[PDB]
Amino acid sequence: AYWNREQEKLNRQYNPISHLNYCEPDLRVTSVVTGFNNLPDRFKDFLLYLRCRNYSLLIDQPDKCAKKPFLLLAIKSLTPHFARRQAIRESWGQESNAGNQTVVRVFLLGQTPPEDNHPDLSDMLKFESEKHQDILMWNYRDTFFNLSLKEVLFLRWVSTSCPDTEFVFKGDDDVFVNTHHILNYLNSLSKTKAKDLFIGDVIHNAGPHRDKKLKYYIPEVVYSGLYPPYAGGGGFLYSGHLALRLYHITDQVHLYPIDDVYTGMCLQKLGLVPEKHKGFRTFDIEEKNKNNICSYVDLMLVHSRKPQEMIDIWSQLQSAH
Amino acid sequence: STPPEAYWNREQEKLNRQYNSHLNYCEPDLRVTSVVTGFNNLPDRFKDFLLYLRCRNYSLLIDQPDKCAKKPFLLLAIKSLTPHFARRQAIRESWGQESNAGNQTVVRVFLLGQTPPEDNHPDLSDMLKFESEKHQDILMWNYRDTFFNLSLKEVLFLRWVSTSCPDTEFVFKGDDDVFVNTHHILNYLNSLSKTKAKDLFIGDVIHNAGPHRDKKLKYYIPEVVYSGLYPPYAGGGGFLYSGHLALRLYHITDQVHLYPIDDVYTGMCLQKLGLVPEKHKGFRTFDIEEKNKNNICSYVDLMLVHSRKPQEMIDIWSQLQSAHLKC
Ligand SMILES: *[C@@H]1O[C@H](CO)[C@@H](O[C@@H]2O[C@H](CO)[C@@H](O[C@@H]3O[C@H](CO)[C@@H](O)[C@H](O)[C@@H]3O)[C@H](O)[C@H]2NC(C)=O)[C@H](O)[C@H]1NC(C)=O
Ligand SMILES: *[C@@H]1O[C@H](CO)[C@@H](O[C@@H]2O[C@H](CO)[C@@H](O[C@@H]3O[C@H](CO)[C@@H](O)[C@H](O)[C@@H]3O)[C@H](O)[C@H]2NC(C)=O)[C@H](O)[C@H]1NC(C)=O
Ligand SMILES: O=c1ccn([C@@H]2O[C@H](COP(=O)(O)OP(=O)(O)O)[C@@H](O)[C@H]2O)c(=O)[nH]1
Ligand SMILES: O=c1ccn([C@@H]2O[C@H](COP(=O)(O)OP(=O)(O)O)[C@@H](O)[C@H]2O)c(=O)[nH]1
Ligand SMILES: *[C@@H]1O[C@H](CO)[C@@H](O)[C@H](O)[C@H]1NC(C)=O
Ligand SMILES: *[C@@H]1O[C@H](CO)[C@@H](O)[C@H](O)[C@H]1NC(C)=O
Ligand SMILES: [Mg+2]
Ligand SMILES: [Mg+2]
């Protein structure tokens, strides 16, 4: 498989044409990937531009972490998702300073360019960024298969602009997160379990989906074998110290079309295994418990909820029993 | 003794006898708790619909008073909710663009109410005000924007046509999740006789419909609320009518009680005018066949298709501009 063979080459370089800033189309893939011409467009773009990751930040918040945070909330989003971001601001993503444990929030965006037929929402996004001061936007095409790029550029921003946050929560903009429970959990940790914390909805021994109709389909010609253990499904929680170690190792791992698999590949290279926490309810909760606020007291996150549902749950949680 | 009709029917019978306050009484009408059988067991949307039925004098908070300074040929009026920024912007850029080919002016408004914090809506109100200042195409009224208040959205829009755009030749009223082939609409309007034009009303018209009685369905209506059948009505995403008829509809709205389903209410008003809306097969409110969805020639001969995402509307519109070369 192509990714496996290219990654083996990387392994030989680090453990005896750039893979990091070559940003012309890599036309060699049209010769060496069998059946390249019949691959879906997302795979063609992924393969042609694999070796380019030096994209610039167009909208930054460089002093976001001027007061060293206890918890950084970093939420993946797309330009048009205004209601999702605003509901997060008002509910579980509120910034705070309780107990002098500061919580800060950023949203992680790429471009939604006109060539992909996106409406031009640059005026609204600028208004939102000036009002709320929490948008980070980079100059790459925001797509599902560039989410591992979103991951690497975010880790690069943690390294440059938020290196001292004690913990990081990285998650999606359609999950409900019980941030109080997350904070209670983090404050229970020993110094030892904290320095390399990485928890979430972790699966072992998964492999690529081979059914061409599935969202996470990966052809055999792109990747072979099984996936490393990885946390997926909507969000995960880890230490800022480990964030720096993860950023440093990203140069040694080729980007991958599925972001959460990529993060698992970086952890494996560090010799770490992410740990499952049952409070990450990435397949929702039982239908019978969905209208009982007590079901939300004992979890970390649940996928998926609409903007109004996030605000409704958060408001009810504040008076739970 | 013949069985009593449902609550809506009995109030409409009263209205009919008065014409042959129900308009600005805005306290809760507590009489409904006594006369609507099983009121206490109704879903909340019905309780609110019934308690505030007699109130329709809500203020315009964001207006575009000069929208029709030049008498339009076609007014595009698109129902939307505050958070739908991407839908509105895709419509502006594609099929809802304002234009003036052949001096037949096309102008656009989006029709909004409030999305208040009490309904757990995120606060996007400052953004909306900025959007209105940038694009000058938002009409916003001070009422709670909900599915069961869409007939209120209809009446307040028709009131605005009467006060602020009474001379538009035609009106298209539609949803913000449809693709509209506005070029085909303009050619259709330019094909009409003077007489067919004065009372044009076309869309995806259903005859012989009645209220859905299954409590799990979106358009469920209890038997204690409405009894009997629906008049013919155009539904499904948009419909097209003359500005002259728009004024006749506005006048008759005082004579028809509001109704939880906006397109049925419009059908009720047309019936009271003695008109029957006409089906046009180009209103593809259940979409087109899967095998045709990626052939731009399928969009050339339709009026509208439900439903399309913002990126899909822009893609279709872009390809449509050169479809004459392939179709
Ligand atoms: C991930 O994001 C990157 C950066 O935005 C995307 O790279 C860009 O991809 C487009 C093609 O989709 C490239 O445009 C094409 O360039 C060729 C060669 O000059 C030109 O002939 C085509 O007409 C078209 O303009 C663009 O150069 C490239 N930009 C870079 C590398 O900076 C990439 O597509 C995204 N990947 C995925 C999986 O979405
Ligand atoms: C359609 O829009 C109207 C106008 O916004 C909505 O009327 C408003 O409905 C709410 C209840 O949902 C009323 O608030 C309630 O008032 C009572 C006392 O008056 C109070 O005890 C409740 O706690 C709550 O505050 C509000 O007064 C009423 N406003 C007006 C101007 O009539 C109506 O609910 C919407 N209808 C539907 C079907 O959504
Ligand atoms: O091009 C993209 C597609 C998705 N997302 C974000 O990625 C997350 C997961 O998207 P989705 O819910 O569609 O994935 P799923 O839960 O189906 O795996 C959400 O925060 C989306 O806003 C993104 O940032 N860029
Ligand atoms: O409270 C509401 C709910 C919906 N809509 C608009 O009503 C139209 C139809 O909504 P929907 O697509 O959900 O209805 P359906 O196609 O299922 O009948 C769309 O323009 C929505 O933006 C609205 O203006 N206010
Ligand atoms: C990355 O670096 C290369 C070489 O310095 C440069 O040519 C390219 O433009 C950069 N890519 C981007 C997207 O900035
Ligand atoms: C409608 O008019 C009545 C009486 O003039 C007034 O009491 C009421 O507040 C008005 N309704 C609204 C929503 O402004
Ligand atoms: Mg999701
Ligand atoms: Mg619809």
Quick recap:
The first copy, chain A, has helices at residues 2-14, 29-32, 41-48, 82-90, 122-132, 147-161, 179-187, 191-195, 240-250, 259-269, 294-297, 307-317, and strands spanning 57-59, 71-76, 103-111, 135-141, 167-172, 175-177, 198-203, 230-239, 275-276, 280-281, 301-303.
Short descriptors:
homodimer, 321 residues, alpha/beta, Spore Coat Polysaccharide Biosynthesis Protein SpsA, Chain A, eight-stranded mixed beta sheet, globular, binds a molecule of 3 linked components (NAG-NAG-BMA), binds uridine-5'-diphosphate, binds 2-acetamido-2-deoxy-beta-D-glucopyranose, binds magnesium ion, transferase, Glycosyltransferase, GT-A fold
Note down, in words, how this protein is organized:
Two copies of one chain form a homodimer. The relative contact order of chain A is 0.15. In chain A, the strands form two sheets. In chain A, strands 1-4-3-2-5-8-7-9 form an eight-stranded mixed sheet, sandwiched between helices. A three-stranded mixed sheet of chain A has the order 6-11-10, with helices on one face. The first copy, chain A, has twelve helices and eleven strands. The radius of gyration of chain A is 20 Å and the shape is globular. Chain A has a single domain (57-321), classed as Spore Coat Polysaccharide Biosynthesis Protein SpsA, Chain A (Alpha-Beta Complex). Chain A is an alpha/beta fold. Chain A is 35% helix and 18% strand. In chain A, helix 6 (147-161) crosses helix 9 (240-250). Chain A binds chain B through residues 79-80, 82-83, 86-87, 89-90, 116-121, 123-124, 127-128, 131, 307-309, 311-312, 315, and chain B through 83, 85-86, 89-90, 92-93, 119-124, 126-127, 130-131, 134, 310-312, 314-315, 318. Bound molecules: a molecule of 3 linked components (NAG-NAG-BMA) (2 copies), uridine-5'-diphosphate (2 copies), 2-acetamido-2-deoxy-beta-D-glucopyranose (2 copies) and magnesium ion (2 copies). Residues 23, 25, 42, 45-46, 49, 52, 140-141, 143, 145-146 of chain A line the site of a molecule of 3 linked components (NAG-NAG-BMA).
